[PDB]
C-alpha cells in the first residue's frame, strides 16, 4: 500500500488515524530456493506477486555465474582490504559521506522541468517498450507488461 505513498490506514481498535509515510523503500530479497534456477522462468524463481513488482521501478537482479577472470579482481580487492583499510588507489578519491550528503542536499533543491523534445522521445520509446514487452507474450524473459508505472518511473 505504501507505494501509493502518503499513506497507511489503521482501522483497528483504538486507532482510526491515517498517518503519512513519505518513505522510500529498498528491498533486498532472495529468489526462490535455492538460487535462481535458470530452468525456471522469471517470476517463477521470484516468489513475489506481480501486483507488487509493478510498483518497483527498478529491480536489480544480481545473479552469480563464476568467472575466472573477474573473480581474480574481486579476490584482489577483498584481500587488499582486509590488508588495508582504504580501498581505492591509483587512482580515485572516495567522496566522504558528510560532504556527499551536503551535495545531495544542495541537489534536492532544484525541481527541474522537461523539454518538449525529451517528452516526445519518452513517449515514442514508451510505445516501443510497451509493444516490445507484450510482443514477448508468453513467458521466459519478461517481466511484462511494462505497465505505465514504468513510464512514470522512467
Amino acid at each position: 500500500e505504501v507505494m501509493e505513498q502518503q499513506t497507511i490506514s489503521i482501522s483497528k481498535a483504538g486507532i482510526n488515524t491515517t498517518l503519512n509515510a513519505r518513505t522510500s523503500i529498498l528491498a533486498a530479497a532472495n529468489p526462490l530456493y535455492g538460487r535462481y534456477n535458470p530452468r525456471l522462468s522469471p517470476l517463477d524463481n521470484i516468489n513475489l506477486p506481480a501486483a507488487l513488482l509493478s510498483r518497483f521501478d527498478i529491480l536489480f537482479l544480481m545473479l552469480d555465474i563464476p568467472s575466472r577472470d573477474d573473480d581474480e579482481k574481486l579476490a584482489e580487492h577483498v584481500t587488499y582490504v582486509h590488508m588495508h583499510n582504504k580501498q581505492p588507489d591509483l587512482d580515485f578519491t572516495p567522496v566522504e559521506p558528510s560532504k556527499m550528503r551536503e551535495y545531495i542536499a544542495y541537489a534536492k533543491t532544484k525541481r527541474p522541468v522537461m523539454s518538449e523534445a525529451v517528452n516526445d522521445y519518452v513517449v515514442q520509446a514508451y510505445i516501443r517498450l510497451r509493444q516490445d514487452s507484450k510482443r514477448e507474450m508468453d513467458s521466459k524473459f519478461s517481466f511484462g507488461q511494462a505497465t505505465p508505472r514504468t513510464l512514470l518511473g522512467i
Partner: protein, 640 residues
Amino acid sequence: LRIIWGTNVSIQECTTNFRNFLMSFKYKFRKILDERDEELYYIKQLNEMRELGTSNLNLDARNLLAYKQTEDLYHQLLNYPQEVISIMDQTIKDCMVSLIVDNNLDYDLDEIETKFYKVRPYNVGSCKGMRELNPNDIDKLINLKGLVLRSTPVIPDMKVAFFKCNVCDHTMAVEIDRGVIQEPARCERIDCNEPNSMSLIHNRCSFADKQVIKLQETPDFVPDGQTPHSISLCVYDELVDSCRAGDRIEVTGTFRSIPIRANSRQRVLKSLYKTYVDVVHVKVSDKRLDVDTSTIEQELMQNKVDHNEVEEVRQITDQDLAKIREVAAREDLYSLLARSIAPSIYELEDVKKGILLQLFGGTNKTFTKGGRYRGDINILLCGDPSTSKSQILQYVHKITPRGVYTSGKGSSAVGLTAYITRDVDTKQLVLESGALVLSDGGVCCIDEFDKMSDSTRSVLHEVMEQQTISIAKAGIITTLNARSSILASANPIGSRYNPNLPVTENIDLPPPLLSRFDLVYLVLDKVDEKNDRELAKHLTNLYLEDKPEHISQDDVLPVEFLTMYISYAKEHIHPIITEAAKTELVRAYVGMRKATTRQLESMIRLAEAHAKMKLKNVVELEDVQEAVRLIRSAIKDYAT
C-alpha cells in the same frame, strides 16, 4: 488615549475605528483578489440580521485586512481576541440602536436592541496545525481542521449561583462572574449576625452548557516525523451539539492553557499546563468539498432552527442557480460531467460515470415505517494494476464530505465499529464510533478489498443488505445506522486477470457477495497502439507547467460549479420512475436472467440517479437504456 493594562488596545477610538469601517466597507477585498456587489456588504447584511433577529453576526476577518483604517485592528484582534471581541460586540449593539433611531419605530420597539449581539470572527490567518504552536501564543485566534472522533454529553456550568439560609430563611444569590463562587459567610434575614450555615441549593441556580469535542486534526503540510495528534475543544453555549461526529470542520477559536489537579484530594495543581482550543467559530460547510444530504441531517434542520444558529447547509445565490438551470439544458451534460470528475485521469469514462451516479445515487423511501432502501449504490472495480483504480478512491475521498478511506488488512471487524475504549482523560469507559459508523452518509472507500481477512467481510453482509449494523456486544446493545456507499478496489489473482478462465472465478471472492455489488467494473487493456501514445501524451505532460495548469485543456470543464450543482441536484430533486419504465425495466432483468434479483434493485436505483441528474422529477422511458448498458458495459468487457 486611555488604555487597557496589557492590551495596548485603547477602549473606544477603536470603536470609532471599527465604526467607520462597519458603516463603510464595500469591497476592497477585490483589490487583494485582483478583481479582473457594488454597494457595501455590512449595512445590507446587518439589516438582514435585524429583521431575522438571528443575532450572531460572524464578520469575516479578513474584511479588515486590507482596508484603511482598521489595518491595526486586525492585528489587535488576532492578538487579543477576547477583549477585542467584547469591544466589537458593544460597538455592534450601539450601531444597531443608532441604526434604529434613523427609522424611528423599529420592530416594536426598543426590546430587540437590549438583546445580546455577538461576533463570531473566522477565516483568521493561515496557521500551522496545533502541535507547531509555541507557548508564545497562549491566547490567540487559531484555525483548525479535521474529522471529529467523539463528543461528550453536555456538561452543565454555573452562571448564577444560588443560596438559602437556615435562618430565616432568605433566598438571595451571588453571581459568578470571575471563575470562583464566593459565598457570604453570614447572613441575610436574620442579620443579626448570626453565624448560621448558609445552604447552597444547586437546583435553583442558573447554568449554561459546556460540551467537549475531541478532534483529530489534519493541518496537512506535515513537517513529519509527527503522527496525527488529538485535540480537545470545549465549545460553549449555542454552538453545543452543532457538530456531528465524523465531519470535516474548519473550526477557529482561542488557544488555551489550564492546569488540572493531580491528587483530586489535595489542593495541588500539576504545573505543566494542559492545553486546548476554545472554538469561537465553526466553518461546517465548504466550497471545495461536496455538501451533505438533507434526509440524513433531518432533525438538525428541524432543530437548530428553534434556538436558531448559523451556517450548516450550504447556501446558493440566485444568478448562479440561473446558471445551473442553464447548464442542465446542455445535451452533452451527462458526458460532460464525466470528464470533469477526474481531470488527471484519462479515458475509462464509464468508470468516472458510474461513480458520477454514485454521487447522485438513489432515492430515499420510508414507506409508512421501515422501508429505508436509501440512495446507496455500491461499486467494486478490479483489473490490471497501475490502472488508476486507487486514484479514483483518492479523488472520491476528497470530494465526499464524510467519507473514510481504509486499506485491506489494516482492518478488523472491531475496527469498523464500536471500540468501547477507555477515555484516559477522565479514566472512564467511553464509546467510540467505528470506521463505518463515521462513514455513514457519503462514501466509504476501500483498498485491496479482495485481501480482507475472512472474519472481516462478515461485517459487510450486514451493511450492504440491512443498511444498518447490529451491535449486541459488550456494554451497550443496539442496532445503529450506517447508511453509506462503498467503493472497493480489487486486484485479480493474475494479477493480470488474463483471457478466458471463468471471470466469476477470477475475481476470487465468494460469488454470493460478488453478485451483491450494484455495479462491478472490470477494467482491461487491449494494448491499443494508438492508445499508449495518446495516454503518454496525457501523462508525460506536466512537464509543463511545473506549477500545474491546463490539465485536461483544451477541454471544457466545470470546477467548483459541479459541486454546487451536485449538491443542488441532491437536495432539490426526488425522482420517481412512474409508469413508463416498468415494462422495459423488467424485460431487461429477465433478459439477464435468461445473475440474481439484486441486479434489478440495482437498475432501478442506479437509473434513478441518472434521472436525478438532468433535473427530472420523473424518469423517462429513455435513460434506462444506458442505465442497463452500464451493467452491460462490464459485459462488453467480459468477452475476452
